[PDB]
Amino acid sequence: DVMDVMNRLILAMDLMNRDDALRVTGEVREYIDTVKIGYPLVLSEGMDIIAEFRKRFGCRIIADFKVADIPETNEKICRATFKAGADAIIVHGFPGADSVRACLNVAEEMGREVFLLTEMSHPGAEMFIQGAADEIARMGVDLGVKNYVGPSTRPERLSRLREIIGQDSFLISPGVGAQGGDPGETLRFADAIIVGRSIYLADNPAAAAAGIIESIKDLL
Amino acid sequence: VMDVMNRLILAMDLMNRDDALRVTGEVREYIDTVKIGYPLVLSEGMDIIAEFRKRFGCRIIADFKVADIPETNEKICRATFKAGADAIIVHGFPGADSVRACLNVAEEMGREVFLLTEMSHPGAEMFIQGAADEIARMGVDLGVKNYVGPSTRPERLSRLREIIGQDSFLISPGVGAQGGDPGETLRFADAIIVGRSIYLADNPAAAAAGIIESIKDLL
Ligand SMILES: O=c1cnn([C@@H]2O[C@H](COP(=O)(O)O)[C@@H](O)[C@H]2O)c(=O)[nH]1
Ligand SMILES: O=c1cnn([C@@H]2O[C@H](COP(=O)(O)O)[C@@H](O)[C@H]2O)c(=O)[nH]1
Ligand SMILES: [Cl-]
Ligand SMILES: [Cl-]
Ligand SMILES: [Cl-]
Ligand SMILES: [Cl-]
Numbered sequence: 001d002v003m004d005v006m007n008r009l010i011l012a013m014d015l016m017n018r019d020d021a022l023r024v025t026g027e028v029r030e031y032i033d034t035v036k037i038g039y040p041l042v043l044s045e046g047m048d049i050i051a052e053f054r055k056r057f058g059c060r061i062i063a064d065f066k067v068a069d070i071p072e073t074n075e076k077i078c079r080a081t082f083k084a085g086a087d088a089i090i091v092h093g094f095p096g097a098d099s100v101r102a103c104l105n106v107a108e109e110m111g112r113e114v115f116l117l118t119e120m121s122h123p124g125a126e127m128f129i130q131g132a133a134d135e136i137a138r139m140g141v142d143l144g145v146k147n148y149v150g151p152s153t154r155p156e157r158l159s160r161l162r163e164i165i166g167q168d169s170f171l172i173s174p175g176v177g178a179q180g181g182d183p184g185e186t187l188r189f190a191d192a193i194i195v196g197r198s199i200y201l202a203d204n205p206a207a208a209a210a211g212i213i214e215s216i217k218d219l220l
Numbered sequence: 221v222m223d224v225m226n227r228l229i230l231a232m233d234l235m236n237r238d239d240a241l242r243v244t245g246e247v248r249e250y251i252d253t254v255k256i257g258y259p260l261v262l263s264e265g266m267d268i269i270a271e272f273r274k275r276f277g278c279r280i281i282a283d284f285k286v287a288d289i290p291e292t293n294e295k296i297c298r299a300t301f302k303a304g305a306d307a308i309i310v311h312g313f314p315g316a317d318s319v320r321a322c323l324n325v326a327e328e329m330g331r332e333v334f335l336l337t338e339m340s341h342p343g344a345e346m347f348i349q350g351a352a353d354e355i356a357r358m359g360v361d362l363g364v365k366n367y368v369g370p371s372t373r374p375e376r377l378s379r380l381r382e383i384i385g386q387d388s389f390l391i392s393p394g395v396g397a398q399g400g401d402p403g404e405t406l407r408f409a410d411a412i413i414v415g416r417s418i419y420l421a422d423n424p425a426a427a428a429a430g431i432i433e434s435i436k437d438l439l
């Protein structure tokens with residue numbers, strides 16, 4: 001009852017040039033059927049980039065927009081994003097339950113999915129987010145959230161998040177490669193890993209993706 | 221310090237280009253600063269920012285609630301300033317490195333970062349509020365000079381002003397629709413942000429005029 005992510009690998013396509021983003025995504029298409037598109041690409045090339053990716057590749061689209069506004073604005077952001085063809089959207093939990101519920105309501109109405117970001121993968125996440133993360137996760141469970149994002153860079157924290165959300169929830173995890181998270185270790189807890197720079201900055205992105213997949217072969 | 225006409229910033233969150241341009245045009249004599257967010261940008265494209273500057277000459281604050289890792293924050297700020305935004309709103313909750321990433325790009329491109337410390341909606345009480353004073357102190361430590369705090373809790377807005385000092389610039393949303401009072405908010409904030417009370421009004425011009433009339437002794 002979850003999205004079927006090919007090879008447990010999601011491409012974080014954060015190149016800001018349309019031609020480059022299209023080239024690299026095309027090059028790794030045989031390995032990946034799920035692409036995470038964020039604001040670096042969307043603010044550079046427009047929401048029609050989601051359309052273009054759909055048309056060009058057979059890929060699901062997760063809009064990594066880290067939605068973090070008041071409920072009224074969150075609703076509008078989700079509506080615009082799903083209208084453009086995103087399958088799912090990533091939403092911050094730290095602004096509270098009403099802000100998350102606004103996103104869930106739009107997703108329910110529009111037949112799409114919310115991913116709740118609990119803890120983040122970068123060093124600064126330790127300052128405020130980490131201390132709230134278990135409660136944000138528990139809040140997500142109470143709100144009926146089924147999809148979550150947690151940090152590969154902190155295996156102990158990722159393990160705890162998996163415990164809180166349960167085995168049935170879907171968990172994806174960034175911070176793999178460039179930020180130091182290990183693909184295999186991360187897949188102990190996450191359903192899929194998110195990988196950006198390790199793939200898209202490689203001299204041969206296809207070889208990079210193939211290499212990650214070979215390293216996790218027995219987990220597929 | 222940014223000089224906001226009438227201490228009033230229009231939150232232009234209409235999602236149609238024609239309506240957004242028409243309504244902004246109707247209130248142009250009252251404002252010179254417009255806050256543009258994702259509702260309009262995701263619906264009409266980042267080119268709308270240059271169009272606002274071409275039509276109105278207004279300052280543009282990009283309310284993008286920037287809340288990613290430092291590397292991604294850098295890219296978001298670069299794309300946003302390339303589109304002609306004068307300033308960007310950044311969440312403090314993701315920590316100091318994420319804020320510093322934004323400050324670096326703003327310095328490079330001659331723009332400003334506004335640090336959002338406490339939000340105006342009820343859910344802000346769950347996690348943000350208890351971190352807000354510390355987020356503000358982090359802003360001070362980082363050399364942030366521009367801040368955003370909640371009209372809906374004037375005691376919290378006053379505390380934010382206390383932390384950042386009189387020299388810092390403070391703008392405040394939640395006025396009107398969310399219940400904040402224009403005059404009370406301006407006791408502590410340099411400028412108020414107003415969206416729906418203006419842009420959903422039967423007569424936006426009269427709405428803006430009315431707000432300004434209510435604070436005329438503060439201008
Ligand atoms: O806690 C998080 C949440 N999201 N991302 C996003 O995941 C991707 C990671 O890419 P990378 O492999 O190049 O580090 C980027 O798009 C980044 O904004 C994180 O890195 N950490
Ligand atoms: O703590 C915050 C931060 N930002 N905003 C933004 O300020 C505007 C408020 O508009 P309104 O007057 O229509 O409520 C909207 O764009 C909203 O996303 C808030 O309302 N509260
Ligand atoms: Cl709201
Ligand atoms: Cl930090
Ligand atoms: Cl980073
Ligand atoms: Cl709430």
Ligand SMILES: [Mg+2]
Pocket residue numbers: 327328329
């Ligand atoms: Mg310079």
Ligand SMILES: [Mg+2]
Pocket residue numbers: 403433434435436
């Ligand atoms: Mg008055």
